[PDB]
């Protein structure tokens, strides 16, 4: 969810 929060 690092990349989920960062990208979306």
């Amino acid at each position: 969810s690092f990349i989920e929060d960062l990208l979306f």
Partner: single-chain antibody
Amino acid sequence: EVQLLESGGGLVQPGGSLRLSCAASGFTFSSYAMSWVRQAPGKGLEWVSAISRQGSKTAYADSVKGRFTISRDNSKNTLYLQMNSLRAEDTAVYYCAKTTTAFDYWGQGTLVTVSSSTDIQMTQSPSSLSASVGDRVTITCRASQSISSYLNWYQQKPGKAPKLLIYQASALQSGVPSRFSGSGSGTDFTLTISSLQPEDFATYYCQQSHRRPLTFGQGTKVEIK
């Protein structure tokens, strides 16, 4: 055994369309977000698109907004890029990349030739350099605003896809030699090669994963004399 196999590129007239595919093997495809990154000839890396693990969320760079569509099929372990309304500015090698806090693994890249800000700016210095075997090489990367410690370093051989070298400023990717070190936080970062080797010639890119959109430096080409 991790593999990303791209196909579908080629030559196209302005205004036409192409569909890229990336075939993934060697990891659980549905467990990871996936991106497309492109590189115009003799130019730098530019993030294009990204999609969540299930396909439910997508993101697009402003440059391709409205024209490009990313999708995935987890039952075939395949990532897609539908490119419509193609412009000559879209001319680039396109890579698919497994996306975590960095781009962990890149496909080999497919060429697409089209012929007939509030963003964080990454700047590297120097833009190239030549040094001898055994030399200590230092490269700098500055962000126009703070990126905490989310700074990634990629190594690109001529003609090859980028490989992830260091992520989160100082963490080494598996199998990277200890001669590579990174440091820095906030806005100023450094990559160091303690003892330069002949196989180290490449262009080195930094890239921040602090705030969308993900942005690259313009690269540092390093030659061994």
